[PDB]
Design a protein around this nucleic acid. Sequence first.
RNA 1: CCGAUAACGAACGAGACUCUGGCAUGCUAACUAGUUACGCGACCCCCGAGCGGUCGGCGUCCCCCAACUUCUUAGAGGGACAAGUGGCGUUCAGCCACCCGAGAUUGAGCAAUAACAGGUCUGUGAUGCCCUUAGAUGUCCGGGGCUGCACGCGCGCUACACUGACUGGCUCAGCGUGUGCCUACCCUACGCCGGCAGGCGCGGGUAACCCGUUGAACCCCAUUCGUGAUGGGGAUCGGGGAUUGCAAUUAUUCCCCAUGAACGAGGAAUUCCCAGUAAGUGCGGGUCAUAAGCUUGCGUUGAUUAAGUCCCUGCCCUUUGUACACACCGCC
Lengths: 57, 144, 75, 189, 143, 145, 64, 68
Amino acid sequence: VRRACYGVLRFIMESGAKGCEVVVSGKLRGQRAKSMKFVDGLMIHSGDPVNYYVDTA
Amino acid sequence: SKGPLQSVQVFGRKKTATAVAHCKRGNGLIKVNGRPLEMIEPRTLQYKLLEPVLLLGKERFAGVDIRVRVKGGGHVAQIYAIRQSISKALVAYYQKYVDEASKKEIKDILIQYDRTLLVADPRRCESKKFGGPGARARYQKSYR
Amino acid sequence: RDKLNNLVLFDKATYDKLCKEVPNYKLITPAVVSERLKIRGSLARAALQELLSKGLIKLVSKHRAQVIYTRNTKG
Amino acid sequence: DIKLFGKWSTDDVQINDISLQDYIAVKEKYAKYLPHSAGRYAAKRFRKAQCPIVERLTNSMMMHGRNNGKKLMTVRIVKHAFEIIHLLTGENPLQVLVNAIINSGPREDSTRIGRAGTVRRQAVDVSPLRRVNQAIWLLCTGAREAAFRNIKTIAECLADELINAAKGSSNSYAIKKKDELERVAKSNR
Amino acid sequence: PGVTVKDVNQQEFVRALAAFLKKSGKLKVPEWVDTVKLAKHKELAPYDENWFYTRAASTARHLYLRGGAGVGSMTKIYGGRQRNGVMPSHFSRGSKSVARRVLQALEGLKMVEKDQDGGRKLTPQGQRDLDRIAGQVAAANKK
Amino acid sequence: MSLVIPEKFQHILRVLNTNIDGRRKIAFAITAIKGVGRRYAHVVLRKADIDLTKRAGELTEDEVERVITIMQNPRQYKIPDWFLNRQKDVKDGKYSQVLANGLDNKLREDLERLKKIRAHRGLRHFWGLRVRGQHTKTTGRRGRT
Amino acid sequence: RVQPIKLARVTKVLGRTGSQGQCTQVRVEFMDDTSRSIIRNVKGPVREGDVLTLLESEREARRL
Amino acid sequence: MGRVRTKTVKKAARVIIEKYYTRLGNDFHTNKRVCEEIAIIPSKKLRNKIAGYVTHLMKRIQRGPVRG
RNA sequence: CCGAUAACGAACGAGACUCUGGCAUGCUAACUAGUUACGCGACCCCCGAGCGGUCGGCGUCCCCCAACUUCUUAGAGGGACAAGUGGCGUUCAGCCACCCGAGAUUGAGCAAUAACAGGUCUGUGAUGCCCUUAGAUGUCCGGGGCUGCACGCGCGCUACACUGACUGGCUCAGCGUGUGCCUACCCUACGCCGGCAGGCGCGGGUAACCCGUUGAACCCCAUUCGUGAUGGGGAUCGGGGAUUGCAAUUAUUCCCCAUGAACGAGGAAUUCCCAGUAAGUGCGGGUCAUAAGCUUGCGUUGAUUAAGUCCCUGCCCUUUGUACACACCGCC
Ligand SMILES: [Mg+2]
Ligand SMILES: [Mg+2]
């Protein structure tokens, strides 16, 4: 999961963006669920402009 | 002699009640909703209507005809819109049909007695939030 | 402080009191005359307009909730 | 000149002591034909002082659930009371009210949070603004207490309250509480 | 010295016209006037025996101000307030047939006719009296 | 004029199986009769053509008995068929209106009729429980403790 | 044997007190003597210039 | 109270004062129009906040040596 | 944020932003909004005015056969930025008072890292694992149940009365909805019958075109009530009638007539709140075949105290102590 996310996050910055953040959560490793957040660049969350500044999936 | 194009329609609004005053050259006459001012339901607040004419006297109103229509708000909001309309139409009539020095010596007495006559009240309402029944009241909470 | 037991109908023992000095004070009101004569108060209103018809009592207000009488012009 | 309710002009009223002079608004500038104005007096601290006292009594007279926005009923009650007190005494209703305000405001109180003496511990005197505010509140409450379950009406109750207060006879509710507050405060000096 | 109904007090105007209809006995009155209420919400029958002569007087004044009124317009004008006991109060309309028979009765005095569209309005015949009565009560009130 | 009390003013009257106060107004004084309500009282006084403004105690004896038989017999005196109490009788089908203790024992007769047929409403009545389907979770506790 | 009620005019607002802020502490100067001044605790809103009643001569004066 | 400016508005104010000094004065109304053409301010409520501070620093700049 | 500063240069959050409200007689506009003027009228004045007054009566996009946006609506824009004066301040950041100003703090929406064994597998053709799978935990139908009552708690509605109830008269709102792919079910003017719920015939509206100028409530103006558990309050219960549906009993709801229960302002405690605020007071939408005491919003009337504090309950930064780290509901 981490190795794949590194290639994805690298490719997004390769194509050209101000920042990117990926969060993968669930039944990773053992039974207890955990979340991994690879975040880089700039990433705002508050206000009106986040509506048209982010691509969320 | 019978000159046309002497009419100013200056409004006054208070608590959603928009009031239109029609000021015209002619005999001294005051009428709102096709009714005389003294013939109106809130006799408790009749002096609010009589307030501007009591401050300025009927001598200035002699050459002025007033016809007011109001289509909004509540009872006393309609009244406060009416009295604002009467004064605001009059000062504008003196502002563009005689010298505005006369407009000044009629504005000073009104503005020193009550600012609401020539300044509208900006406060309207507030939205009710889903934490309580009112705009700021919150629903009563319990712990046990 | 149990009951007022006010008299709904005039008796002569107080009717003469009504006719002598009830129109003698400025604040003659239906309520004041009700507790002064131990009369009901509906009777107080009804009889007060009787003295109004006799013209010895002067009115000022005539309100549906607060009607105010007074004595004649003395002096 | 102003003829509040068509009579009872404010030119012939006075305050007997200079402590309350700045905050009583029966002045000729603060004279109003009618005691009703949505003038945004309470937008700031000390900005309610210039509001006319008659209007302050009007606002204060509505309480206890059934009377919270009803100002038309309040003005008609106060106006009928003013004609009543002018009738019963023969002088200016505003002059009777001003005498009542002076005579009803307690000159001292007491407040503490720890182990109080009797009700509070330390006696602290009041400001002229609290003198006025406690006076109006006391007069309004005295009227409501009297006419709860009897045949008397509110215009009468406010009338006798002002009459007993403006003179001082130990029968008005306002001065009865003024006696208690001053006695306990002296006990808590 | 012109007189309009809008120039006089409406409460005293309807009082005058109530007696005017009372003396002119050309007004049809049903047999159940003494029994039923004026509205579904009103708890008690009206105190006045000539309530029909006041309702008919009032609606004539209403038709002066704006025509085209029908049964729905009347029952919305005369709608009151049903306290419903322990339930919260709700606004309730008046009686349909009471207002319907009043408006039907005004053709018996020939002062209300149906418009080209829905609803009905005053005749010029009735409008003549509605101002004449305004003149007499205005003078009596003034003097 | 609000004249003085008449000599033949009965401070309490005696109608059917009850006594009314003559000090209060006649319109609301005959509502003290068990079975006579507010609206029924104000219409039989209109039919009897009595002066409403008077009190109950000054009614003449012939006025009282005339009103009594008006309220006793509703059908033959223009009282509406929809104005009664025992309309469309369970027992004998007739449109009657009862205004005395006979209302109580008629109500008892209907009540014991439901219990004799052991209907659901009757059984709940026999148990002292509610019948109008209302909840018993949190109310009605004053009649129990 | 007794002292009559006097009045004093405030000169400045020093600071709140009472461990709730429900009282203010203000320096006043006597109206019987301009050179006589004390500091007193008074409840309610107080500003400069205003004059307040005084039922007793010296009660409390503490530096906060 | 509660009107303290931000590093965003202040930094732009220092930038434009020492780059366009000759084109600025002591009028809020004039300078807010001056900032329109040299600076691309996306908010109407922000462009008068910059200019309001610009006149503030220009009152001081006529008396003392500001760090800019 | 200014400042110093072994830190420099940044980033998110705060701010900033969007929406809403407050002024724009400045611009564009309008038969799905009107307003002024003119002409027909309708009525009153008439002694006599005569441009006398009123009309939500008709007209002047019934296309050449009046204009305008002030009120209405919605776009482009403007407008307030601590701008100006004084005082305090390192005179920096900034703070207070005042003039002019519609506005000198309008309300929200969004909202950081990190975490909770907080809630949802009963929102899903989200889902792992386990269970069941024809005598089924699938699935359909009939009935009952979810309502059931010696009691305790919470969210609320109605009250306790005259600062009121009833009766009649006068008479002012803004949110917003309205006829359906499945899926049948809209909002309603007008007239007539009935006392009422309702019923019938007729229109309009897929909507600034019609309901609707939303004739709301509160409130105001007069009558009665008269301090009584009274005409306050209407709980419980009987009888009768209608509406929705296949079905109303365990009363769906609504209407009328019947009895009129406690309740006379509420002990220990405690909730919410600083201006269009609370409270009063109704009106929309959601739920709906039938429906609101709930909830979500709107409107009307409209205050008192306060421009402070750490006292209680807590929160943030720094120092401090710790035998705590499942973190004081700790450990012992
Ligand atoms: Mg933000
Ligand atoms: Mg009765």
